[PDB]
Design a protein around this ligand. Structure first.
Ligand SMILES: [Cl-]
Ligand SMILES: [Cl-]
Ligand SMILES: [Cl-]
Ligand SMILES: [Cl-]
Lengths: 262, 259, 262, 259
């Protein structure tokens, strides 16, 4: 019949930080493709709510309460996922926080909280998952990075951007170490994506954000989930150590004047 | 997994061999009808016959991508055969070698003309039909050579592949109000019929310098193009995806050898 | 005494397209450092005016009328420069035009005019200069590229951006071929630089351009000349095939909102 | 050629050896007074004595870059010795090796702490003095490893070097109203005292994989930092300059071999 990509139905995934925002969208996109998904988070109430919301998906979404900055929780997460699903094929190293603080105000704890969730939590879940991902014979790691850091700057986010670029520096070497294991590791770099959190500002400001983007809208969490889904396919086995910016063209204009001359 | 592309309409320039034929076959397997272009009627005919069993219908238009009139003719004939046009794979590419001293104006124009001007002209000629589709997709076949790497003898080739990307970073902005996205696949070293004539020692040396330990397949490029063409990639534009098994990552063979 | 870089006094340079704008600034910066400079251009009146304006510089600025898109003129330029100066050490492949046209309006001639000056004219002057630059034992090629093409998009400039990215694709290979000749080749990527031409718009619009740039001003042609001067130094002999963006931070903000949150 | 930097005031973190000592010597030769930092008083003392004949005065402050209090102390002592502070070279860097499986939390924090947090803390502590100078300059010593390349065993090192750049792309915007620029040099393979203990075969193998055919010198990095520090580089900020002899350009040793 018609064939696009090979179905991922019945494979096993972890989405760290999966109870809300982009991570929830990644989880729902994989579950709609028939992949069983464990989402992680620190807040059991939020995890339970998201598991309930997603109860009708084809693949089964369940939760593990875990702190990505603790390697022992990362190992517990992988073990619990393998127990529930039977193995582990896909890790979406997604968990991310984005508090703001100008350079002169950032404390050591501010810097370590952001680097610890965003960067160390990516490393630790990949480390815990290596043996199972190797055993799968088609392991996939997708990292949720950002345009902020690798490409752009944004006042108040110099530690955030540092952490998102750190993920990429890490994976450019990790892809080489993981190639003999037949695991690929790539990152999605979201631009400005509409989430529950951004709903807490007015249409005025959201319209200003959209008008600065060539696509003329903020992205959806499904836009990120679908990019991660492509990297997870068998058909992406020759893509590794790489990045895909998903931003409706946000990084392209040199300024709003270039947008306006349209 | 993704919304079916069955029944949509695609052009793949330079589709009779190599990466283009892989792109064509990948879309045709997805049920997309595909017009491939090329200058060699025999190669086109051969590939049309080879792919006669695909779900989507693969047919050929003989056309020189360096000629805007052939580009307009290719689009018109595709709209006539299929009913419209959803996807343009601006793929045609040549890669003759010449050291900088040896490159003549004609050498430079032949490579810039096929690889860069032929991408611009097919996009230009397809603009109206792609706009009417409401979900238009352009996928450009670039290269790691030019945008990322250097390779002696390919300074004009690398220039033309980087030129494609400079073009589409602006084109993406001009095309966004028409709901057309434009993105590029940057292949590394892909096993094609031509590379299969090199001998196993040569292919083994090439593969051993790549972290994945093999050359890619033309389907690797076809499937990246297929992703960009999905409705689910509507928020991706002006962007690149390198499909190279890790080729660009090591600083040197010493890094590969540390594995 | 105090030593910064090794003096370039008495070396020999070509600046293509040097009668106005960035190229004039490159020429004046090299001439102030004691380098003799041949500027090229198609308009003898403009060349003569610039030679007159620069008559007091330490190094001597003179002109050759030549079309960068003609390899025979590129060879004549190199020969005339060697005749006037005694050799050739530095080539600034600068000539650039930037007409605007939307994608649906660009003709083959529009595309070839821009690719021919901006890209082919860079290749042809480097080709003509190779034997003399090799003989110098410290050859330098500096390419004037742009943020537009390599990094940004700007409606109406898709052929312009293509041509500026083509220069970089070319030089990433050229640097390898030229390394055994001890010639380096690098590019400056200017952002928005104030020139005679931009003076033909109002302070209103120029202020809007500056306000979109972290440095809070448009750049000067000396900013580009000084970057090219660094690449030309003996102290830059280990820099090759590379780029330096000179733009006051223009490419960094994700949008004007990031600038405004400052 | 450029405006003399004579009499200005610089800090070079990790200045007692390797690239940092080259940066220090290059600025001191330009007549800039330089405070180098390090944890090893003997190495600092040795380098201060070696450079006693420079035009600018090189002196040492013993300090751990991972400690913000030491960063504030380094700035205060530099302002006291020199009268102010014009230039910070955030250079300190370590590069222990460990495969991904073997890296402990402590391994990762040691490298992130020196290479990334130590860059942030010295910039933070210098903000006020750099602002008062009216022409403040920060130059970060990053690496091709992380931002560009991958090297087995250096995934935490590469992360920390890319982290520096993500930081300075925002820092550049925050610092611009203060007239401070911030830029990074990305060294390739540089001949240091440590690399000189490897044997000629090893150094020859490394050099043969680089288009320039040699390892760079610590002065190559020092002179790129010196350019960023000039008044003539005031319109350069948030940017990178790779100093690597072409190392990142070839896709593989085969490309180098075609020369
Ligand atoms: Cl990065
Ligand atoms: Cl490019
Ligand atoms: Cl480029
Ligand atoms: Cl980076």
């Amino acid at each position: 019949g018609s064939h696009m990509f090979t179905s991922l139905e019945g494979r096993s995934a972890i989405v760290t930080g999966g109870s809300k925002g982009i991570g929830r969208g990644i989880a729902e996109t994989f579950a709609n493709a028939g992949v069983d998904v464990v989402i992680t988070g620190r807040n059991q109430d939020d995890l339970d709510r998201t598991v309930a919301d997603l109860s009708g998906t084809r693949g089964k979404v369940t939760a593990v309460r875990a702190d990505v900055t603790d390697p022992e929780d990362a190992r517990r997460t992988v073990a619990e996922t393998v127990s529930r699903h039977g193995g582990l094929d896909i890790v979406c190293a997604n968990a991310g926080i984005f508090p703001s603080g100008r350079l002169e105000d950032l404390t050591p704890d501010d810097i370590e909280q952001v680097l610890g969730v965003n960067f160390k939590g990516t490393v630790y879940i990949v480390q815990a998952a290596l043996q199972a991902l190797t055993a799968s014979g088609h392991g996939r790691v997708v990292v949720t990075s950002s345009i902020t850091g690798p490409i752009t700057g944004y006042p108040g986010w110099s530690h955030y951007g540092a952490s998102k670029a750190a993920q990429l520096g890490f994976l450019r070497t990790a892809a080489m170490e993981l190639a003999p294991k037949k695991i690929t590791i790539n990152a999605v770099l979201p631009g400005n994506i509409m989430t529950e959190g951004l709903d807490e500002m007015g249409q005025d400001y959201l319209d200003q954000m959209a008008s600065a983007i060539p696509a003329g809208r903020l992205g959806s969490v499904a836009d990120i989930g679908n990019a991660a889904l492509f990297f997870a396919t068998d058909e992406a086995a020759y893509v590794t150590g790489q990045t895909l910016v998903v931003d409706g063209g946000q990084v392209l204009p040199e300024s709003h004047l270039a947008i306006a001359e349209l």
